[PDB]
Amino acid sequence: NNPAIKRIGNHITKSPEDKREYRGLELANGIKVLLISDPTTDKSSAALDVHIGSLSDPPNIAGLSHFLQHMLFLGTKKYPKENEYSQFLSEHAGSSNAFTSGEHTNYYFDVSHEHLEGALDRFAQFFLSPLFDESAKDREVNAVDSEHEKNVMNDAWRLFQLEKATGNPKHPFSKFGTGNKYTLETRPNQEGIDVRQELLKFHSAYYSSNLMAVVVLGRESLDDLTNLVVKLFSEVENKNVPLPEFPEHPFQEEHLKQLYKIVPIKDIRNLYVTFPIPDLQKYYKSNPGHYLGHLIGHEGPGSLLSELKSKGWVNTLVGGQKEGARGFMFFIINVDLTEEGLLHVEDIILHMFQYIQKLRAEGPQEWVFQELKDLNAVAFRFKDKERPRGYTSKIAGILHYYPLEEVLTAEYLLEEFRPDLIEMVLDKLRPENVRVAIVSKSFEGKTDRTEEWYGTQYKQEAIPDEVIKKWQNADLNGKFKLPTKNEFIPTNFEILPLEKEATPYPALIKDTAMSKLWFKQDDKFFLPKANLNFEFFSPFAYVDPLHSNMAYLYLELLKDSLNEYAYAAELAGLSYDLQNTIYGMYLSVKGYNDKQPILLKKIIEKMATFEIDEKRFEIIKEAYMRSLNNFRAEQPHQHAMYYLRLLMTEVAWTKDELKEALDDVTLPRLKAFIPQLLSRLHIEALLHGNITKQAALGIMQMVEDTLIEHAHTKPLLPSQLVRYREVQLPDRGWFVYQQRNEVHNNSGIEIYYQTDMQSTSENMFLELFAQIISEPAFNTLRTKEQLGYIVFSGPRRANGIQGLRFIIQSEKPPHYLESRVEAFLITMEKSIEDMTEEAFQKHIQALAIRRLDKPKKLSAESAKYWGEIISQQYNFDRDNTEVAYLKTLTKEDIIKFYKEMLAVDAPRRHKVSVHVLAREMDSNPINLSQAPALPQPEVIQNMTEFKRGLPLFPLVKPH
């Protein structure tokens, strides 16, 4: 009947717990479409995936596909305002982004459910009549260069592109993907190329409707959603572009039996073992790569990782199938290297082929496939409700790979047990096919090659045939047994009935000297899952740097101890998180509630009766030292945030302080630390999910009784439960802390306009002003001025205080960015006075929609509560309370707030700035808007003296 629709998909199989409505379509022009009707969703969303990516980049214009991705946002024929897309979304509680892989370009947005169409119309125009304005082209090319510049000093990106540089250079795999100013402007303007033509030429060539997939999720009916998609997208022209495919592998014979010695930027020691394999995508129901990844990557008793760990050679192992484009895949094994493991790489690789040989000797195991099949089956049935933005983006990508009806299940459910494919893949994992990469600072100065795009220092060697042969004659190693039946797989998925006295927010069901137990039985999601969060308080976890180091190492050793045992539970959807905090320890247990108390007890017993393996202690301590040192190579803007956190917190130990004190951490001193840490505690816990009140009370009591028994834990005094305060900046003051980043050749800056203690009033003044400036700050400071790829503004909340913050990472010096952001602030003062009275209320409803967005999954709701609890504020109805007040704010209230707190001449201005200089930046002192003249900043020369000379804020009264 309808001619714009080539077909409609029969029922789209979904989880029986998924209340959303689905319909599959293929438009006349060949666009595969999935429509999602959720009358609940507070935000609607849509996404489009083009099966074109970096691999289709022209050889002479590296990165064109990624650059074009940036350019669709900046103006259409029907919506030619450069930022009409960003502006429309920002004014309607929306967000958007996109990425570019080798074979895909993925665009997605979300917006208030009442404006899906308006957003979708502006969005669809991306693929119909993009302007590619010559002025915006010359500006946005800098954003791409900042993005690459960011990644140049990143160890992961360097390895990523080093592999591409290592294979067949004729293969598209070797293409530089990111793009930068050289390949997108300098070199083209050198070769006479009109880039706007090549952007138009490419878009018109590859952005065909036959290579497109669309997902739209909104409150609208499935029929209404069908009409909408047909209305806006059926006019995309079908150029019948043949889908690019790459049968020939990027690694041929001459690229096998090769070894690479690579110099990293951080101090890391890693070993990568890779095998070229055929594309396993088609076998999505047999899934042989996962079967082998599951066994080879296993961390339980009898596993490869175990023996490598026991011999002190490796600490972590990751294995499985790595994606390449259509027609070629990889199999990777990734181990980090201890100081010893670096010297026994030959043996480590041998041990790898010994385990692989075991897998060949045992043959395919149907029970293993059954276990994997059953776990995925459960996982899909009780899948968590996704956020609309990420859900449309992911579905939009896999519409290209599976039938309309299988699109939801294809990546989860298993069907065929294929022992032939298991042997077929397993046969490609052989020493003649292997490629070895070693990453260690120990190759410093010993490299004879340089990777052109990132500068990576490396040396290429052929693996001796004598060594290949050793690997081929791999005996069976009696230390490698297959795993056993996973006893942690859940069997009881019964949702307990909702108790009479249940509450909508967490109830304080225990307030003893040792425990403060917050509890809420789930009344929204009804999945067999629960979240168990515990905060352990001890003044001895952060009393001084030495004790912080031991707090860390204690838990790192403890987790190391349990890993073998706990790994099974993780595969079974029962995971735990355990880490030291500036107040003590944090333990969270999330997953299926069935086997949950068994794991929780094993943890607390291990905590209270922990016995340290000295060999593990020395190895973890060494990795910890490198972890600290390796912070010198982090992004400049993260340095900025790091420093400011040190500057404004009452107590805070710097990395250097920790690093210096780490040598004094002997095994004896650690053994003494642990029982002292556990001797006096206060536990504040949130138990939330599919559990009853007395199950929770029993959980909490069991945790206590275990500690009391084995660690003789007494309570802490209420006066010991002191939280840290934030430094109180003086009226009209401006302080500047300056540091250099010795690794990255960009600079970073954070600017913090401290306002006042958190309050229902002061909270919303800030949040509303931050909303009004959110999009403009990005549009002015990045899109126009192109200060850098990373440009962020928004609230900063810490220790009960708050304020406005800007974060920029740029090539320009920090003191320059200071003026440009200062200039931008005056731009807003006018922008508000001229801003219409409706546009003001527009921003209010936008914030309101965001603040009231209902959590979709249990974990997300638990986080809301857990924030209220660790912040000592316990404002569980905060969203209704604070949004209500927000709506009464007037355009005048915000101007008084700005003139009094934020303006350059504000009476109560509180400005502290962190300047992180680039690696080579000398020690620093048109059509643009006017920057105001700034006072002389007081330069923090010493952080300890800075805090001594300033007051400390109070702490927010709770409730």
Binding site: Q69, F73, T100, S101, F160, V318, G319
Partner: peptide, 12 residues
């Protein structure tokens, strides 16, 4: 740890 299967992003 089994890992199964970058991508260059538009925005910070």
């Amino acid at each position: 740890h089994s890992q199964g299967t970058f991508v260059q992003w538009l925005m910070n």
